[PDB]
């Protein structure tokens, strides 16, 4: 029994928390959908 419940509208929020850095990474994507570093 997998099921869904609505959680919200899809909207941008002006008052959003801001955080996180912006790394530049070399990666490879294999046949199984897995990313790895290169």
């Amino acid at each position: 029994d997998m099921y869904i419940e609505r959680a919200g509208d899809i909207t941008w929020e002006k008052d959003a928390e801001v955080t996180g850095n912006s790394p530049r990474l070399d990666v490879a994507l294999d046949e199984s959908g897995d990313f790895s570093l290169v």
């Binding site: 869904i4 941008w12 929020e13 928390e17 996180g20 570093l37």
Partner: protein, 148 residues
């Protein structure tokens, strides 16, 4: 059927992921559902398209989301963590550089049950889903978008 962001639940109950309803199609990550049919109230949502390498699946119809990160602007993760109200987290993506081109990436680390949460541009368009990524020891998620 209504447009919006949804929890994906399983049976006590556990939240295994998140997805996006748009234009009558439900969008989530393959690793969340493994393509299983989904219950919505008294109705059933059957898988329509899926791809393990993209880690994406759509239900009721073909993949509808086609906006893309512009490569310069901040975006918002509309995170729906287990047990928490949907909330917006604004960030500037970094980049996954691959042999086949660059993909935006967000260096945000939420519980696994947040996988499938949408990432939005300033217009409110879904530019991809959260939850397939790499570890650098912080997690970084690709901004994973399908093809319409």
């Amino acid at each position: 059927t209504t447009d919006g962001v949804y929890r994906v639940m399983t049976r006590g109950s556990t939240q295994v992921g998140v997805g996006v309803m748009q234009e009558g199609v439900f969008h989530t990550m393959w690793h969340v559902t493994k393509g299983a049919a989904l219950r919505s109230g008294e109705g059933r949502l059957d898988p329509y398209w899926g791809d393990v390498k993209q880690d994406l699946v759509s239900y009721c119809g073909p993949w509808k989301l086609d906006a893309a990160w512009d490569g310069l602007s901040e975006v918002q993760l509309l995170a729906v963590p287990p047990g928490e109200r949907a909330k917006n987290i604004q960030t500037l993506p970094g980049i996954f550089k691959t042999k086949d081109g660059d993909i935006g990436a967000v260096a945000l680390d939420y519980p696994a049950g947040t996988s499938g949460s949408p990432i939005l541009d300033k217009s409110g368009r879904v530019i991809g889903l959260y939850g397939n990524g790499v570890v650098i020891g912080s997690y970084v998620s690709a901004i994973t978008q399908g093809k319409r």
